[PDB]
């Protein structure tokens, strides 16, 4: 069902840009380990940071698992999933630490969390 | 066991990926380094022409860099890469500099050592040999300003009379596949040339005060030339070594894969034979 | 189709080999860059959406446009828009070219198509 | 036990990711080395002789030390020696740390464990 | 019987160090095939030379095999086996060729076998 004729053009375009940037980061983690990260170009350096935020932004705290970790649990609607990844991919939200995107639900919750961590 | 072959295949495939990644980045670095070394040729030629024609054309014979002096203390400059995986590039120059000093005097109080590259130092430290000057983590695209300090200091140690003679040990980019260790002396000046022509210069400054600036600039430029050739030979050595390593990894993956296929295919036809015998036994 | 397919196969062979080594942006020389851009542009011409068959006469004119270098200055992202626009331009006011290909099954005189195509390129990219 | 198990789990997972290409180490970035060094040391703590069960409070006390980096500074070969010496020190003087962990089973008293540990690492 | 409760501390420690150095050498024959031996670290370089000496010092000419080995035949006591492997593991014999450890019963023999070759 991942076709423009069954789901929105914005849904199809974001999901494509996500799979692409993740694959590009996978093609570079050998070079990032053997050679200094200071050897990567400006474009690739930003591509790595965005892939790093997106990789954890896919994480979500579940209600049935609240007892294990103590995290309340979240439900995210389709409009906010698309809007969240689009805002990261479009490079609007860059001056926010990677730790803020781990276990948060919607992207506004990640933005307040950055501040909760005093950053 | 099939599991030993399969785990060995996954490991060798990871090494093949690792070697190919380093070969292509080194290929990209070589294409630039070869052009960079060639781009400085007109500057290296122009500086050698002005310093030689100014010094040789009645520039005096008693000047400290041009005059003959008895030799007791000798300086050595060694060039090595800040990272390995370049085959015999580092082992050749480190072995030849060690064996050449060992053939005259091994004692650490007679000579003076200078090293460029972490691998070169690590070797001398494990060899129990001291060093006077050191420089590491240089960029793969070196600019004169990156080595201007060690270049000015090494020539300065000779100008101050602390060294009687100074030598350089480094590899040269003779061809895209074969490179060899070269030995040359930086000071004193011995590579004389004929007074064929003379360039324009100011009449007021004394010859000694001129030589004390222009001749060190030539030596510093020559250090940069040797470094440019070292970068070209390093990138070519890492590229050719990682090409051979990638080729070795592929024949090992091919041979292992045929053994994995034979071990698995041999086991499958036996299971089919047990089904036949088992069903016929009822 | 034979008069243009031979060029397509030779150009893609060259691209498919060097494309791997030339993965970086512009380190290769002009002699290989020309092959790379041609291969990329021909690869765009090979792309086609679902349930949308293209008739043989239109296939001949678009493949003829790529294999003779008329797309060599068009940006890679505009090749698909150029293909839809050029085919509608030829069908809406130059049906003589398409009817000749349909009945002769061979290209005799291509001169009309070269002149009619230059007129599209200068007026609507 | 859970609290200290967690940090051990992340350290080992990261070390397993890095060891696939740990073949070269003089070329690896210093940051990668931090991951390699920590992982080698956590592996050593897990090594144990046959018929030598360690009591849960002591397993907690040692995993806590490795995970918080207190065994990181000790040399890889010397870690096994340091483990026994530290456990004999904690039981022989100020045994209150081992007594509290048996009763409450929840830690939350680490300021003393840290300060009491610094007195051992000062000379042994 | 290979337990610290049934054999001496010196025997247990020497056997442990032998099995470990041979396993480390087995884990490197791929890396030595893909990359040049000049690319291995000093520690791995020594581990290869010691494992090479050990694998052939484990060889011995038997009395019942004089027709096949062309050598007299030897009997080695436990004390000289433990002393022998400990002396190689501790690096006292690094300046001795690998070929001197092949087909000799005891360590003193390996040293005169090195003398029989300038």
What secondary structure does DSSP assign to A4-56, as a single string? Answer: TTTS-HHHHHHHHHHHHHHHHHHTTHHHHHHS-GGGS-HHHHHHHHHHHHHHH
Contact by Cβ (8 Å): D98, D56:
no
- CA distance linking residue A113 with residue A105, whole number of Å: 11
Question: Does residue E31 sit at the D interface (CB-CB below 8 Å)?
Answer: yes
Report the 10 Å Cβ neighbour count for C23.
11
Contacts of B164 (CB under 8 A, 6+ apart): B69, B70, B71, B72, B73, B74
Q: For chain E, where are the alpha helices, taking DSSP H only?
A: 9-26, 31-34, 42-57, 66-69, 78-89, 107-115
Measured in degrees and rounded to the nearest 5, phi and psi for residue D15 equal -60, -40
Contact by Cβ (8 Å): A14, A89:
yes
Residues of E in contact with D25 (CB under 8 A): 41
Question: Does residue B136 sit at the A interface (CB-CB below 8 Å)?
Answer: no
Contacts of D115 (CB under 8 A, 6+ apart): none
Interface contact flag, D28 A34, Cβ < 8 Å: yes
Contacts of E21 (CB under 8 A, 6+ apart): E47, E50, E51, E54, E89
Question: Does residue B24 sit at the C interface (CB-CB below 8 Å)?
Answer: yes
Q: State how far the alpha carbon of C34 is from the alpha carbons of B28, B176, C39, C80, C82, in Å.
A: 19, 25, 9, 20, 20
Q: State how far the alpha carbon of D113 is from the alpha carbons of B81, B157, D66, in Å.
A: 46, 55, 13
Of the candidates B82, B24, B250, B87, the one whose C-alpha atom is nearest the C-alpha of residue E40 is: B87
Q: Which chains contact D through at least 3 pairs of Cβ atoms less than 8 Å apart?
A: A, B, E
Selecting from B14, B15, B84 the residue whose C-beta is nearest the C-beta of D27 gives: B84
DSSP 8-state assignment for residue A93: S
Contact by Cβ (8 Å): D72, D51:
no
- DSSP, residue by residue, B36-67: HHHHHHHHHHHHHHHHHHHHHTT--S-STTTS
Measured in degrees and rounded to the nearest 5, phi and psi for residue A23 equal -60, -40
**Closest chain D residue to E27, measured at CA:** D23
Identify the burial level of C90 via C-beta atoms within 10 angstroms of its C-beta, where 0-12 means exposed, 13-18 middle and 19 or more buried: buried
Q: Would you state the structure tokens that stand for residue E7, as one six-digit string?
A: 């054999």
Selecting from A34, A36, A37 the residue whose C-beta is nearest the C-beta of D21 gives: A34
Selecting from B21, B83, B140 the residue whose C-beta is nearest the C-beta of A31 gives: B21
Q: Do chains C and D touch (3 or more CB pairs under 8 A)?
A: no
- CA distance linking residue A54 with residue A17, whole number of Å: 11
Interface contact flag, C27 B28, Cβ < 8 Å: yes
C-alpha distance from C28 to closest chain B C-alpha (Å): 9
**Closest chain D residue to B18, measured at CA:** D21
- CA distance linking residue C85 with residue B135, whole number of Å: 61
- DSSP, residue by residue, chain B: -HHHHHHHHHHHHHHHHHHHHHHHHHHHHHHHHHHHHHHHHHHHHHHHHHHHHHHHTT--S-STTTS----SSEEEEEE--SS--STTHHHHHHHHHHHHHHTT---TTT-EEEEESHHHHHHHHHTT---SEEE----SS--HHHHHHHHHHHHHHHHTTS-SEEEEEEEE-SSSS--EEEEEEEES--------------SSS-HHHHHHHHHHHHHHHHHHHHHHHHHHHHHHHHHHHHHHHHHHHHHHHHHHHHHHHHHHHHHHHHHHHHHHHHHHT-
C-alpha distance from D55 to closest chain A C-alpha (Å): 25
DSSP 8-state assignment for residue A112: H
Q: Which chains contact A through at least 3 pairs of Cβ atoms less than 8 Å apart?
A: B, D
Tell me the CB-side half-sphere exposure of residue E38, using CA atoms within 13 A: 14
- CA distance linking residue D10 with residue D21, whole number of Å: 18
Contact by Cβ (8 Å): D70, D90:
no
Report the 10 Å Cβ neighbour count for C113.
20
Contact by Cβ (8 Å): C90, C101:
no
Region of B115 please: left (phi>0), alpha (psi -120 to 50) or beta. beta
Resolution of the structure, angstroms: 2.5
- CA distance linking residue E37 with residue C57, whole number of Å: 63
Bridging pattern class, strands B133-135 and B180-187: unpaired
**Closest chain A residue to D29, measured at CA:** A36
- CA distance linking residue B47 with residue B199, whole number of Å: 12
C-alpha distance from B86 to closest chain E C-alpha (Å): 8
**Terminal C-alpha separation, chain E:** 43
Q: State how far the alpha carbon of B2 is from the alpha carbons of B11, B259, B260, B263, in Å.
A: 14, 9, 6, 7
Identify the burial level of C82 via C-beta atoms within 10 angstroms of its C-beta, where 0-12 means exposed, 13-18 middle and 19 or more buried: buried
Selecting from B88, B91, B249 the residue whose C-beta is nearest the C-beta of E34 gives: B249
Report the 10 Å Cβ neighbour count for E88.
24
CB pairs < 8 Å spanning A and B = 13
Identify the burial level of E24 via C-beta atoms within 10 angstroms of its C-beta, where 0-12 means exposed, 13-18 middle and 19 or more buried: middle
Report the 10 Å Cβ neighbour count for D3.
13
Question: Does residue B256 sit at the E interface (CB-CB below 8 Å)?
Answer: no
Identify the burial level of A111 via C-beta atoms within 10 angstroms of its C-beta, where 0-12 means exposed, 13-18 middle and 19 or more buried: middle
**Closest chain D residue to E5, measured at CA:** D50
Residues in chain B: 282
Token pair 């630039």 is found at B32
Contact by Cβ (8 Å): C102, C84:
no
Residues of D in contact with A33 (CB under 8 A): 18, 21, 28-29, 32
- CA distance linking residue A50 with residue A91, whole number of Å: 8
Residues of B in contact with E36 (CB under 8 A): 87-88, 241
Domains and CATH numbers, chain B: 24-240 (3.40.1380.10)
Interface contact flag, B88 E38, Cβ < 8 Å: yes
Residues of E in contact with B248 (CB under 8 A): 33-35
Q: For chain C, where are the alpha helices, taking DSSP H only?
A: 2-21, 30-46, 56-67, 79-93, 95-104, 111-123
Interface contact flag, D24 A34, Cβ < 8 Å: yes
Q: State how far the alpha carbon of C76 is from the alpha carbons of C36, C63, C73, C84, E106, in Å.
A: 12, 16, 9, 14, 77
**Closest chain A residue to B16, measured at CA:** A30
Breaks (C-N over 2.5 A) in chain A follow: none
> Residues of A near B (CB-CB distance < 8 A)?
30-31, 34-35, 39
**Closest chain B residue to E37, measured at CA:** B87
| Portion 73-132 of B in contact with C at CB < 8 A | none
Contact by Cβ (8 Å): B212, B159:
yes
Q: Would you state the structure tokens that stand for residue E81, as one six-digit string?
A: 């086996």
Q: State how far the alpha carbon of D18 is from the alpha carbons of A22, A29, A30, A38, E35, in Å.
A: 19, 11, 10, 19, 20
Contact by Cβ (8 Å): B167, B97:
no
Q: Do chains A and D touch (3 or more CB pairs under 8 A)?
A: yes
- CA distance linking residue E32 with residue B15, whole number of Å: 12
Question: Does residue B140 sit at the A interface (CB-CB below 8 Å)?
Answer: yes
- CA distance linking residue B28 with residue B17, whole number of Å: 17
Region of B125 please: left (phi>0), alpha (psi -120 to 50) or beta. alpha
Report the 10 Å Cβ neighbour count for A81.
18
Interface contact flag, E41 D26, Cβ < 8 Å: yes
Bridging pattern class, strands B165-172 and B180-187: antiparallel
- CA distance linking residue B42 with residue B39, whole number of Å: 7
Selecting from D23, D25, D26 the residue whose C-beta is nearest the C-beta of E31 gives: D23
Helix (H) or strand (E) holding D37, with range, is helix D30-46
Note if the bond before B188 is cis, omega within 30 degrees: yes
């Amino acid at each position: 069902i991942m076709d423009p004729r069954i789901v929105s053009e914005e849904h199809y375009e974001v999901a494509r840009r996500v799979r692409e940037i993740l694959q590009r980061y996978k093609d570079l983690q050998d070079i990032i380990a053997i050679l200094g990260m200071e050897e990567l170009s400006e474009e690739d350096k930003l591509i790595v940071q965005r892939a790093r935020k997106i990789q954890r932004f896919l994480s979500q705290p579940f209600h049935v698992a609240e007892h294990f970790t103590g995290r309340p649990g979240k439900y995210v609607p389709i409009e906010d999933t698309i809007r969240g990844f689009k805002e990261i991919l479009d490079g609007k939200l860059d001056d926010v630490p990677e730790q803020a995107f781990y276990m948060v639900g919607t992207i506004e919750e990640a933005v307040e969390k950055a501040k909760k961590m005093k950053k | 066991s099939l599991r030993d072959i399969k785990t060995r295949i996954n490991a060798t495939k990871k090494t093949s990926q690792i070697t190919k990644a380093m070969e292509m980045v080194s290929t990209s670095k070589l294409n630039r380094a070869e052009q960079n070394a060639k781009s400085f040729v007109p500057y290296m030629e122009k500086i050698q022409e002005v310093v030689a024609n100014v010094a040789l054309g009645a520039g005096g014979a008693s000047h400290p860099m041009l005059v003959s002096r008895p030799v007791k203390k000798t300086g050595y400059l060694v060039i090595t890469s800040d990272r390995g995986l370049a085959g015999a590039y580092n082992s050749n120059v480190l072995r030849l500099v060690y064996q050449t000093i060992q053939k005259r005097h091994a004692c650490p109080d007679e000579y003076a050592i200078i090293v460029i590259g972490r691998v070169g130092l690590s070797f001398f430290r494990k060899r129990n040999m001291p060093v006077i000057l050191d420089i590491t983590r240089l960029p793969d695209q070196p600019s004169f300003a990156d080595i201007k300090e060690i270049a000015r200091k090494t020539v300065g140690l000779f100008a101050d009379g602390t060294f009687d003679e100074l030598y350089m040990y480094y590899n040269h980019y003779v061809s895209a596949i074969q490179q060899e260790v070269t030995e040359r002396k930086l000071l004193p000046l011995t590579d004389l040339a004929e007074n064929k022509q003379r360039t324009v210069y100011e009449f007021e400054p004394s010859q000694e005060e001129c030589l004390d600036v222009l001749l060190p600039q030539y030596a510093e430029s020559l250090i940069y030339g040797a470094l440019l050739d070292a970068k070209a030979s390093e990138h070519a050595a890492r590229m050719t070594a990682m090409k051979n390593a990638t080729d070795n990894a592929n024949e090992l993956i091919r041979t292992l894969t045929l053994s994995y296929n034979r071990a698995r295919q041999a086991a499958i036809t036996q299971e089919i034979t047990e089904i036949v015998a088992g069903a016929n036994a009822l | 189709m034979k008069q243009v397919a031979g060029k397509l196969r030779l150009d893609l062979a060259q691209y498919r080999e060097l494309q791997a080594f030339a993965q970086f942006a512009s380190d290769l020389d002009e002699a290989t860059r020309a092959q790379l851009e041609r291969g990329q542009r021909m690869t765009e011409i090979l792309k086609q959406p679902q349930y949308s068959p293209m008739p043989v006469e239109k296939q001949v004119v678009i493949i003829y446009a790529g294999t003779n270098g008329y797309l060599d200055d068009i940006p890679v992202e505009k090749v698909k828009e150029f293909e839809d626009g050029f085919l509608e331009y030829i069908e809406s006011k130059h049906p003589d070219i398409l009817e000749e290909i349909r009945e002769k099954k061979a290209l005799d005189d291509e001169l009309e198509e070269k002149l009619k195509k230059a007129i599209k390129e200068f007026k609507a990219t």
